[PDB]
Amino acid sequence: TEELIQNSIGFLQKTFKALPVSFDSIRHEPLPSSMLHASVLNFEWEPLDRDSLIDIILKRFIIDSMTLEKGLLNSCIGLDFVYNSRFNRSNPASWGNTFFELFSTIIDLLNSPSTFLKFWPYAESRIEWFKMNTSVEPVSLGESNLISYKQPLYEKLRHWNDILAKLENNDILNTVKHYNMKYKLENFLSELLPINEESNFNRSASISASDVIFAADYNFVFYHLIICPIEFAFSDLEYKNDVDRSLSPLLDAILEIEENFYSKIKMNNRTRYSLEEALNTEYYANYDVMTPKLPVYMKHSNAMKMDRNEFWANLQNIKESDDYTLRPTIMDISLSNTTCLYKQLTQEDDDYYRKQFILQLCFTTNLIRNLISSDETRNFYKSCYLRENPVNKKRGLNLCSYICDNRVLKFYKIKDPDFYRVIRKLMSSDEKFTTAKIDGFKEFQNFRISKEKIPPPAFDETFKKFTFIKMGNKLINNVWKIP
Amino acid sequence: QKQIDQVRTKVHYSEVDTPFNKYLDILGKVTKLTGSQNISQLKESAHLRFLDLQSSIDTKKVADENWETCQQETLAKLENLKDKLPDIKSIHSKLLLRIGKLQGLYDSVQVINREVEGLKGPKELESINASMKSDIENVRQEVSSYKEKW
Amino acid sequence: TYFESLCEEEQSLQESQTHLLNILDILSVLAKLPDLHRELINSSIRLRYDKYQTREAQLLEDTPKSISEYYSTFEHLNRDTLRYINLLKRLSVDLAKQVEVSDPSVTVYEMDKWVPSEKLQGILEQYCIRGVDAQIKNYLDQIKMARAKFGLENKYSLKERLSTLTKELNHWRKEWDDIEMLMFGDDAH
Structure with missing residues (x-):
């Protein structure tokens, strides 16, 4: 009996073309109300086990319709039907499977990242439906009824990992829509699962992957120190010196430019303050208030206030529109050019490229000191590497204290605290999570959700009445009781 | 070390692929029973599991196709990059002149500040002189009043 | 395959x-x-x-030169836009802002809403080219003359009159005060 299936498909495709809902009015905000004429929600349709039969019907239907707005819209109505028809189901608790299945297959057809981003807000709005693995009843907000090694996800998770893995390899054939799609997919999966799931938190630390005289050194210290921190910690007293030989002249060559940059502004403020206190009678400059702020004539003029607006609009549409979908990111240093790099670092005006570097140093140099100083950490890492694949201290701590504590902090702490502080706050905030990952994120387990209703409180409005011993105590009052 | 890769190749080819397996089950069961009315029931599960499996393959035939084309378009897009340079160079030119103009402004302000210092009060010397001329009339008036009343 | x-x-x-x-x-x-x-x-x-x-x-x-000149300029752009943004605010030059407020019916000046010399406003905005710089060159001398006129009027015109005119006022509020106080001060007694 394939006849029955085909004619059921014609039936559904008939009735679904009558519901008056548009794509925008079905995906983003809503979920379609129970306007379905419930006698269809009772599985007693016109052309006639029962469940899986309905399943293969719906699946066959969706596959046909996708081969645009009619397709996507029709499918979305499909899923919403599946949700709205829980109870009229033999073994209702078994509605989860037939749901997830019908979703994944849709993800498959989707012949672009553009159609994907076009379709995704639908999935964004209905996350609460993906939870409730088999619980027919809605779940309390902030709780996930779902486990990563069992029936619903047991293969879905593997597949959706293969999509990302494939999407990451073609490193050069990615347009900004790709990098903007992998984001939404990942961010999606990081929410179905709780915060400590053996899968969300990266359970095992898995570190990612004359100008020529200048670029040579920069390149050197990059590939030898930053990208591999462990291969610098547990090395000989020579490699640890080989890197040392390259680092220092570079670092000096940058902390020479930074002082010029900061030493221009100091002048262009001190002179102005001196003029102000000179001309006026009784005004005081209140030094040490550097606090950049733009001048008055550019704040008040509206003409100048508009040119910048139209300019940013222009560059915005040029950078955003198509034909320009292979853009380098902002702020990305290009190493292999070796002639622009020197120019990107040795500028006196823009500071934003000499800061990323120092951020990188102050990031790894934290971990090194943490390793050599604390046994528990390097114990943990040793355990990780081995489960993957079955005086020196003094020098390391010296070149660790030389940079993040002797030339950097003693520089920015005096030059500009508004950037001096953020470094210390991040370096602090890192150890928190490091120790948190040494443990199995047990802290994020104690999180409790109070579930109880509360009515408005009581507000007394009544004062306190009096008594009949008017004068106060009885004794004094008896006196006025005399005639 | 033979053991390590010996298991690594094992994990490298793991598969789930449920519906296929589901078909193999109903396939072999008939054989096992064959070596020697409810069978109509099996007939039901015969068709169903046959359709599903089939449908699955269809998607894998479609998806692999689509992806392929998406790598060719973005490939050809990377070729004709002659047309795209002139415009971006125009924008880059404009932004190269704005900095120039602004820089000239920050020069003019500089010379103004450097010349005010060479100096007292443009409208101060206005209200002061006005006050100086406004009252001498009054003094002449009152002195004429005392010369009168005498 | x-x-x-x-x-x-x-x-x-x-x-x-x-x-x-x-x-x-x-x-x-x-x-x-x-x-x-x-x-x-x-x-x-x-x-x-x-x-x-x-x-x-x-x-x-699972496992042709225009391109390489397409990223270069497209990177120069991302390098100058930053220098521009920093050049607006953090590297800015500001003006002197001395106060010359008239209307003596006010005591605090708040030192912020200074909004200089609405004549100067149009000249500065005119930038957004030697003409404007020459117009500055003239503006300065203009102010240096106008300020210099009255700074000498007050010293050589009005001081001279005020001195002698206020020196021959006491001369008839004093002696008149005698001719009015002496007689009518003892006459009643």
Whole structure:
């Protein structure tokens, strides 16, 4: 009996073309109300086990319709039907499977990242439906009824990992829509699962992957120190010196430019303050208030206030529109050019490229000191590497204290605290999570959700009445009781 | 070390692929029973599991196709990059002149500040002189009043 | 290839289904055979064999100068936009802002809303080219003259009058005060 299936498909495709809902009015905000004429929600349709039969019907239907707005819209109505028809189901608790299945297959057809981003807000709005693995009843907000090694996800998770893995390899054939799609997919999966799931938190630390005289050194210290921190910690007293030989002249060559940059502004403020206190009678400059702020004539003029607006609009549409979908990111240093790099670092005006570097140093140099100083950490890492694949201290701590504590902090702490502080706050905030990952994120387990209703409180409005011993105590009052 | 890769190749080819397996089950069961009315029931599960499996393959035939084309378009897009340079160079030119103009402004302000210092009060010397001329009339008036009343 | 291998797999599936149905028919009549038994066996072997090939086939397949001048300028852009943004605010030059407020009916000046010299406003905005610089060159001398006129009027015109005019006022509020105080001060007594 394939006849029955085909004619059921014609039936559904008939009735679904009558519901008056548009794509925008079905995906983003809503979920379609129970306007379905419930006698269809009772599985007693016109052309006639029962469940899986309905399943293969719906699946066959969706596959046909996708081969645009009619397709996507029709499918979305499909899923919403599946949700709205829980109870009229033999073994209702078994509605989860037939749901997830019908979703994944849709993800498959989707012949672009553009159609994907076009379709995704639908999935964004209905996350609460993906939870409730088999619980027919809605779940309390902030709780996930779902486990990563069992029936619903047991293969879905593997597949959706293969999509990302494939999407990451073609490193050069990615347009900004790709990098903007992998984001939404990942961010999606990081929410179905709780915060400590053996899968969300990266359970095992898995570190990612004359100008020529200048670029040579920069390149050197990059590939030898930053990208591999462990291969610098547990090395000989020579490699640890080989890197040392390259680092220092570079670092000096940058902390020479930074002082010029900061030493221009100091002048262009001190002179102005001196003029102000000179001309006026009784005004005081209140030094040490550097606090950049733009001048008055550019704040008040509206003409100048508009040119910048139209300019940013222009560059915005040029950078955003198509034909320009292979853009380098902002702020990305290009190493292999070796002639622009020197120019990107040795500028006196823009500071934003000499800061990323120092951020990188102050990031790894934290971990090194943490390793050599604390046994528990390097114990943990040793355990990780081995489960993957079955005086020196003094020098390391010296070149660790030389940079993040002797030339950097003693520089920015005096030059500009508004950037001096953020470094210390991040370096602090890192150890928190490091120790948190040494443990199995047990802290994020104690999180409790109070579930109880509360009515408005009581507000007394009544004062306190009096008594009949008017004068106060009885004794004094008896006196006025005399005639 | 033979053991390590010996298991690594094992994990490298793991598969789930449920519906296929589901078909193999109903396939072999008939054989096992064959070596020697409810069978109509099996007939039901015969068709169903046959359709599903089939449908699955269809998607894998479609998806692999689509992806392929998406790598060719973005490939050809990377070729004709002659047309795209002139415009971006125009924008880059404009932004190269704005900095120039602004820089000239920050020069003019500089010379103004450097010349005010060479100096007292443009409208101060206005209200002061006005006050100086406004009252001498009054003094002449009152002195004429005392010369009168005498 | 992978696609082709899929096609062949589907072919084999279609090969076996018909034999299956064909046997279940005979069982349906029962409530000859060994042939179909053998057939279904062989076909099933063929399919199951036919998958592994598509698995391995899958897993294998996973692993002209204008371009290089397209990224270069497109990077210069991202390098100058930053210098521009820093050049607006953090590297700015500001004006002197001395106060010359008139209208003596106010005591605090708040030192912020200074909004200089609305004549100067148009000249500065005019930048957004030597003409404007020359117009500054003239503006300065203009102010230096206007300021210099009255700074000498007050010293050489009005001081001279105010001095002598206020020196010959006491001379008839004093002696008149005597001719009015002496007689009428003792006359009553």
